[model samples]
Target: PSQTSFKPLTVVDGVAVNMPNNHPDLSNWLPSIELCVKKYNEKHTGGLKPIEVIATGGQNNQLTLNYIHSPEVSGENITLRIVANPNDAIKVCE
Candidate 1:
């Protein structure tokens, strides 16, 4: 990642500040999320392996991240939906 300053969404006085989609900060931001996922996977077992983040291919309006487990286990894979809006929180779903 470059030395560019990347700023993600933050709540200031209960307001959300937006960041550009092509912002260079993304390079730094993504790795942090991936690291969190990796740590989570390490502490958990059974279909708890972290998967890659899937994007819409266009812009960063939305994305899907998942975890992988054995195919033999039902509901082993857990998916999370991420919205581009900084104010929004990630949604976890089956």
Candidate 2:
């Protein structure tokens, strides 16, 4: 299996937040996030929330997951920064 590093970035209480040192292949990463979004929407009703991946586009060695949500919802964009070295791991920026 191909290995890659990934991390999630989200806004919480008006501040950007993320985890550290996550390593997963594309297959594992996509489904995990989708399931997470599914669970969250199941309990929470109304308001803008991530339901699915509407589109994906990226540049400068980065990946972006654009969430499909109500226009009223803002700041739901997720980006994964990529490094050239396979040995390089994901790091939470300070």
Worst-scoring 10-residue span by lDDT in model 1: 68-77
* Cα distance off (Å), candidate 2, residue 85: 28
Clashing pairs in 1: 6-25
Instruction: Give the top-scoring candidate (lDDT).
Output: 2
Query: 1-94 in candidate 2: lDDT tens per residue?
Result: 1222323344322222223334224432343334444544655555544433332223233343443432333344545753332222452110
Per-residue lDDT over 4-93 for candidate 1, one digit per residue giving the tens place of the 0 to 100 score? 222223312222222444533443334334444545556654434422222111236443333322122112223254444323256331
Over the full model, what C-alpha lDDT does candidate 2 score relative to the true structure? 0.36
- The C-alpha TM-scores of every prediction are 0.26, 0.26
CA lDDT of every candidate: 0.33, 0.36
**Per-residue lDDT value at 39 in model 1:** 53
Off by over 4 Å in 2: 1-25, 48-94
For every candidate, C-alpha RMSD to the true structure in Å? 14.9, 14.4
